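Let us work through a complete example step by step.
Step 1: write down the sequence.
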Amino acid sequence: MGDHSQKDSPEDFIINRLSQALGIQKEKIKKSLETQQDDKGEVTNKDEFIQQDNSTNILWVSGQSEKCTFYYGQLIDKFKKKGIAIKLGLHKLTNENVAKDVVVVLLEHLNSVFNEIMSPVMQNPLNQQGWTDL
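Step 2: predict the structure and record it as tokens.
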């Protein structure tokens, strides 16, 4: 079972933390921010349908706060999970779900430097199953 439009929010409360929490849900702040209209249908299209941002913009000018969507755009410490990566939903509860932490702040460049250093670590390791090929 795990969960669906809730599973993403459940493992999102624990993992995020901010150094010490491990909540595991129930996020009353998250259920109240759910009613943006676009963000809810976005979070539902991520949970049981593979891309979902969860933004946290602090101070600045016109901060997003408890914002984000499913793609859309962050202007903002966010995080994108996978969930049924075209469709692996209505079976094993998104077993290929891939999470990654994306802080406020470049840092967008430094993240890109670590992504390339990961993908080169992948190429040195396996060779892939023809999805990479030559």
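Step 3: interpret the result. The chain is about 30% helix and 5% strand.
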